[PDB]
Amino acid sequence: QVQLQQPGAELVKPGASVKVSCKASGYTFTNYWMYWVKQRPGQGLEWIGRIHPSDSDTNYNQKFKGKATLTVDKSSSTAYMQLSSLTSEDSAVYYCAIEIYDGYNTMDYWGQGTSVTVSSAKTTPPSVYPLAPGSATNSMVTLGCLVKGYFPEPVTVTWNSGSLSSGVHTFPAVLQSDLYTLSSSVTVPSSTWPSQTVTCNVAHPASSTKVDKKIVP
Amino acid sequence: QVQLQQPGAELVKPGASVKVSCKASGYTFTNYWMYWVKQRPGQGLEWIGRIHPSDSDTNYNQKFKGKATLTVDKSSSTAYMQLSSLTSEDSAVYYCAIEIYDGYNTMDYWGQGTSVTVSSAKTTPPSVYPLAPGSANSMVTLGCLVKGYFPEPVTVTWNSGSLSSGVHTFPAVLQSDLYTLSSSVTVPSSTWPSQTVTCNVAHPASSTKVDKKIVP
Amino acid sequence: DIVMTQSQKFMSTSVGDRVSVTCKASQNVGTNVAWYQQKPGQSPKALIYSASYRYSGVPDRFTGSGSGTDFTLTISNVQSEDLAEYFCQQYNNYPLTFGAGTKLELKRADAAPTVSIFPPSSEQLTSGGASVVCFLNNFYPKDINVKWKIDGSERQNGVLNSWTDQDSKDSTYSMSSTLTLTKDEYERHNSYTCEATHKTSTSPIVKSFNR
Amino acid sequence: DIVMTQSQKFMSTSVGDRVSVTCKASQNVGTNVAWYQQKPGQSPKALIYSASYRYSGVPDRFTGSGSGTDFTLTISNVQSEDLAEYFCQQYNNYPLTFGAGTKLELKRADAAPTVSIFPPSSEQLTSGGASVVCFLNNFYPKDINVKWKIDGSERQNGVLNSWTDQDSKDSTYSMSSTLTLTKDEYERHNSYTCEATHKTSTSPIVKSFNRN
Amino acid sequence: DIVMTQSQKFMSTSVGDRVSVTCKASQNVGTNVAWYQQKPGQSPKALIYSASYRYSGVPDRFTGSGSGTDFTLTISNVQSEDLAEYFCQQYNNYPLTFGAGTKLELKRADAAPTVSIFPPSSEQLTSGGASVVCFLNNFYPKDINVKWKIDGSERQNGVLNSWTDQDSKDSTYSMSSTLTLTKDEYERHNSYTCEATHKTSTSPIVKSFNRN
Secondary structure (H helix, E strand, O other), X not given: OOEEEXXXXXXXXXXXXXXXXXXXXXXXXXXXXEEEEEEOOOXXXXXXXXXXXXXXXXXXXXXXXXXXXXXXXXXXXXXXXXXXXXOHHHOEEEEEEEEEEOOOOEEEEEOOOEEEEEOOOOOEOOEEEEEOOOOOOOOEEEEEEEEEEEEOOOOEEEEHHHOEOOOEEEOOOEEEOOEXXXXXXXXXXXXXXXXOOOEEEEEEHXXXXXXXXXXXO | OOEEEOOOEEEEOOOOOXXXXXXXXXXXXXXXXXXXXXXXXXXXXXXXXXXXXXXXEEEEOHHHOOOEEEEXXXXXXEEEEEEOOOOHHHOEEEEEEEEEEOOOOEEEEEOOXXXXXXXXXXXXXXXXXXXXXXXXXXXXXXXXEEEEEEOOOOEEEEHHHOEOOOEEXXXXXXXXXXXXXXXXXXXXXXXXXXXXXXXXXXXXHHOEEEEEEOOO | OOOEEOOOOEEEEEOOOOEEEEEEEOOOOOOOEEEEEEOOOOOOEEEEEOOOEEXXXXXXXXXXXXXXXEEEXXXXXXXXXXXXXXXXXXXOOOOOEEOOOEEEEEEOOOEOOEEEEEOOOHHHXXXXXEEEEEEEEEEEOOOOEEEEEEOOEEEOOOEEEEEOOOOOOOOOXXXXXXXXXXXXXXXXXXXXXXXXXXXXXXXXXXXXXXX | OOOEEOOOOEEEEOOOOOEEEEEEEOOOOOOOEEEEXXXXXXXXEEEXXXXXXXXXXXXXXXEEEEEOOEEEEEEOOOOHHHOOEEEEXXXXXXXXXXXXXXXXXXXXXXXOOEEEEEOOOHHHHOOOEEEEEEEEEXXXXXXXXXXXXXXXXXXXXXXXXXXXXXXXXXXXXXXXXXXXXXXXXXXXXXXXXXXXXXXXXXXOEEEEXXXX | OOOEEEOOOEEEEOOOOOEEEEEEEOOOOOOOEEEEEEOOOOOOXXXXXXXXXXXXXXXXXXXXXXXXXXXXXXXXXXXXXXOOEEEEEEOOOOOOEEEOOEEEEEOOOOEOOEEEEEOOOHHHHOOOEEEEEEEEEEEEOOOOEEEEEEOOEEOOXXXXXXXXXXXXXXXXXXXXXXXXXXXXXXXXXXXXXXXXEOOOOOOOEEEEEEOO
């Protein structure tokens, strides 16, 4: 399977430098252009540049000529984008992507995107609090999960390790007092809860935090 | 003349408190309601409350009950609004205002507004640089760069207000806890460089008044 | 740089019907134009290359057209799963430049919210803080108002609100409102109420708890 | 609280014509409605009280109407001086609540920008910094793009841009663009160029100076 | 001076259950501590002396305990008649010092208020004044909001509000709201409304009269 693997997040002080990685596997790494695109939070897509891993040939957007440097490591099949002299305008999600035409079909492959956050604040893992209804009774029951006080973005919220998908609303995080907070709700049959365990799984890769919070009655 | 006198700006640290003053003159201070309005940067108007200086009777917007306290000092004809436990959401311009109906006409009177900035940064006066055109038309454009100050606001005039037409004063931009704005004036070529053109810049938060001549 | 101008920031249609995005290039780019679909929180997904050719996996509901400067992306039999932002892009000249994006909006009948209130968990109470959470799920239109009351007294401070995008299943909206207080401030009061105001009824939906 | 809903965030017309901004009260407020005008950088000014009565000094061009929940402010013979944000307010019920504000815009013909460039002043060069300023004055419409080229090479780092509101005399817009460098980097190059791209010309308006 | 610090300003229970209030002394007072009960509008009533001994006429439901610095007054089978503020006191050291006082509260089910409106009496109208009185009796919880409307316009001035303490019979609360105008203002309007917003109903309770 063709895969592009990127780290989830990276926190970097202003004026420092960061090297985003894109580990390719399952295909001939030196046969396809590796593209890099940037997306500021809430904004549109921007093309940074592309590099051919065969000979490290590059095409840069002039806007990122001195800021972004594209390299490759053919011994590990990894592409690197280095961002230097970091400012607030550099905080964005950085995607790596390739396009493969095999003589029959054309397919695109994207990494998950690396959320780069430029700030002097340190990492804070999220506090996960269960949202149980309260004793004071219908065919459905809504449970919740409060993911409070983390930095930086992002976090991933799943229910029962992904077994619960229908009836799930995960709300966009809001920044307040230099910390992020989001919430998630799930609506399950009253025969499911409180009889069966319902678990809120929260992952915060910037702090290496994985918390499984059960919604106890 | 009826006048409400507010200081231009106030810089307060977060969590501290500040007392905005509104000095009245030219009318019976205890005859009309004193109103207070808040306007956040770029936002709309919000009513904080009103106080009648005769007996200090108050009507408060419930949103500001624990935050704002309205008092008066009749011996100096001054109204005060105290803001406590200041946060970033309290950085705004605060107006005092009155409304006088005299049996014939109805007039409103507003203070200039006090620019409250809630920050931990200190004051920085602006550097004022002249923008003179390159060496060698019937009209010449001059300029003035007001760079690196905090907090808002600053006042920019040309020739002490004598030059008003052809003036463009641009809104300030915040970068790295410092504000920067610019101002341009276009005058006849018979005016400059034959006559002096002066950029007057005032920054009340730092007691700064700079008059920068545009020299060829 | 070549400017790709997507005129409309939003396009509207009903489920099962059709919709079209337009994108105009400042200069002639031939047919070297691509289209991308991005769902909230997901990586971009290429739909069209060479103005009218589909990537593998793209259904024929997505059709691209246009040459020179004017290009159009048409979506047929639109379903709620198609809710996403759509970008045009030119790759005929350097630098490669994207469009500003166009968000698909789906029309539907009005829907009243389902309101749930949640007291501060015993776990959070050990941290010195206290948050009360109110969920407002599956309502339409998006315009809604939440109001917190503490012993009948309105409280606007410490309130954090977040809205989801249009739902990928039923095209509704959801909202989460969290009222955060200190543990001692929370223990000084008893009645905590979440009041929801929406166009689907003149009487607000009220959810509350005590202690 | 009573919600004062001004349906339009922007109202547009031409000079000499008329414009009307509406305001919707969530409950019947009778005629206890006021209107305010606020020009940029100035304190608010009261125009109308009791839904339809003018404050002293307010011209008859400003008229108010409506009763109950529907209210309308109408500005006749609109001039460039009327460029401001207009708020409705209810004072029938407590707390007193304003509308969101409707900003007035004036439609006019296109206008190419007058572009002036200014090298760093010798006074600033003593501080170790160097700012190049480009004024783009009196253009319409507002959409405009400025590119800074240092020796023919685009530079977008350190560019501070600021746009004025619509001018109160000719209804045009103006823009100021400042490119800030260090003193040593400014002296490492020679050609400094301000290029203005506007819909009034297919070719950009170019202004350059050589540091020599 | 010895300080007597009562930990709680308010103590809450239901009718029939029990409460306890604690008092902390800054220095040792042995057992020379007294407890007092004070109902609204009455002189204090001595309940306990020597920390644990009762005055004549005090029921055994009032029990005092403690020695040294920590003292406790317990009331079992609490009834609505026991609603009062309770004080501790030390008479071991001079000057004798009291505690700050703890007011007893009683939890009970919600109760909607009974609202009654009264126009100005003809007697007061001869004096030039005019007071409209609104009674809001026997509601729970104590939180309530009252608005006055004159022909639809809200009047939040010239209003005098008074709350009773918790009722000694049914543990409810009561409110009196009086809007005072001059006789001229009163005769210049017709509809006078007393609006009550309480937790027990999302819609306000409305009592009005038309002077007509």
